[PDB]
Design an enzyme around this catalytic site. Sequence first.
Site, PDB file in Angstrom:
ATOM      1  N   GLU A 118      13.342 -16.651 -70.116  1.00 17.23           N
ATOM      2  CA  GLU A 118      12.799 -16.236 -68.430  1.00 17.23           C
ATOM      3  C   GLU A 118      13.298 -17.206 -67.717  1.00 17.23           C
ATOM      4  O   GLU A 118      12.618 -17.665 -66.694  1.00 17.23           O
ATOM      5  CB  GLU A 118      11.490 -16.160 -68.330  1.00 17.23           C
ATOM      6  CG  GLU A 118      10.581 -14.358 -69.786  1.00 17.23           C
ATOM      7  CD  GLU A 118       9.326 -14.266 -69.171  1.00 17.23           C
ATOM      8  OE1 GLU A 118       9.322 -15.083 -68.801  1.00 17.23           O
ATOM      9  OE2 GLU A 118       9.452 -13.197 -70.235  1.00 17.23           O
ATOM     10  N   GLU A 176       9.776  -9.317 -75.859  1.00 16.01           N
ATOM     11  CA  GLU A 176       8.199  -9.449 -75.786  1.00 16.01           C
ATOM     12  C   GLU A 176       7.473  -8.429 -75.676  1.00 16.01           C
ATOM     13  O   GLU A 176       7.876  -7.928 -74.142  1.00 16.01           O
ATOM     14  CB  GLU A 176       7.736 -10.343 -74.912  1.00 16.01           C
ATOM     15  CG  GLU A 176       8.523 -11.893 -75.518  1.00 16.01           C
ATOM     16  CD  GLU A 176       8.693 -12.624 -74.437  1.00 16.01           C
ATOM     17  OE1 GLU A 176       6.836 -12.819 -73.795  1.00 16.01           O
ATOM     18  OE2 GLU A 176       8.879 -13.947 -74.166  1.00 16.01           O
TER      19      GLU A 176
END
Length: 346
Positions: free
Chosen positions: A156, A274
């Site tokens: 991320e 995710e």
Amino acid sequence: TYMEESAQSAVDNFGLGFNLGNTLDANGCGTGKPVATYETFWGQPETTQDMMTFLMQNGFNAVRIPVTWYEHMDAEGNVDEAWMMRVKAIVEYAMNAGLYAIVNVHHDTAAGSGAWIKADTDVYAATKEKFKKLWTQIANALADYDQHLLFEGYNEMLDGNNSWDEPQKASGYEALNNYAQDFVDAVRATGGNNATRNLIVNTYAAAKGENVLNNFMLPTDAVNNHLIVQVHSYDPWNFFNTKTTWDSECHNTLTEIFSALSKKFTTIPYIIGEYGTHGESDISVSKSSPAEKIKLAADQAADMVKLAKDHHSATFYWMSIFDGSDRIQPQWSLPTVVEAMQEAYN
Ligand SMILES: [Cl-]
Ligand SMILES: [Cl-]
């Protein structure tokens, strides 16, 4: 034996996926500690073969293994041999179980202390050689595993101010796009199976807003059909704390996400690397949540799995279904959520 296959074939074979989160990604105890001190630092048990076998035998076909690397690197970027061997051992657990597995570079990105890979052009220039050296070591160490093993360049990535929606400066996208290219270059340069291994590149923040998708540039690859793009989804943000049921707003929020992703990515597969109930302050479902909130989790997961299948994508649950002490039994932490997923997939 390595049997080359397209990125889409991989994604279509993932089935139900699971994130072994807060495990090899756990960090913050400093350098030079015993391997187990990192792996258990965020409360999870040490990983075992039985856990991976349990995943395969209970309807899952893929595992994402987040790994955080910085506390395991010396000043020169060399990865401690003991850490690499433990990453290798957990990969081998997954391989043996028959699973697909993804290994990444995790809390080296984003908002935690110690993150060093950032969507910032000064940071990129200062760290690109260390990043390529990290990937070279990872690729070389994991070179001999078959096509069931994929590499994910970075998790991320955020700008220097940890902006979660989009970088504050548009230049942040150049840094991200350059790291993605360097990841692919570094891995391919090691040859062997890594010449054609399927690789995964993530968007800014693993987000999927209009600007983030528009400014994502897929790396150039010398071989075809061997890149996958990854995003994450906890949408609608904070629903676990604000919604009673997984309702029309929730569902429409997801269908719009898949429609946007499919429209954007017409030449490559994408995955939802995710998803889960984690919202404000990482507050999320547990097996002691009210029955209604567990149903909410179950309903989100059923929708996510079906929509992803319909869109020729694949999904990886973040943690909650197979957590803590339940992993060593092994047993599901949230069997009603797993049952909703299995029946949506089937
Ligand atoms: Cl920290
Ligand atoms: Cl997160």
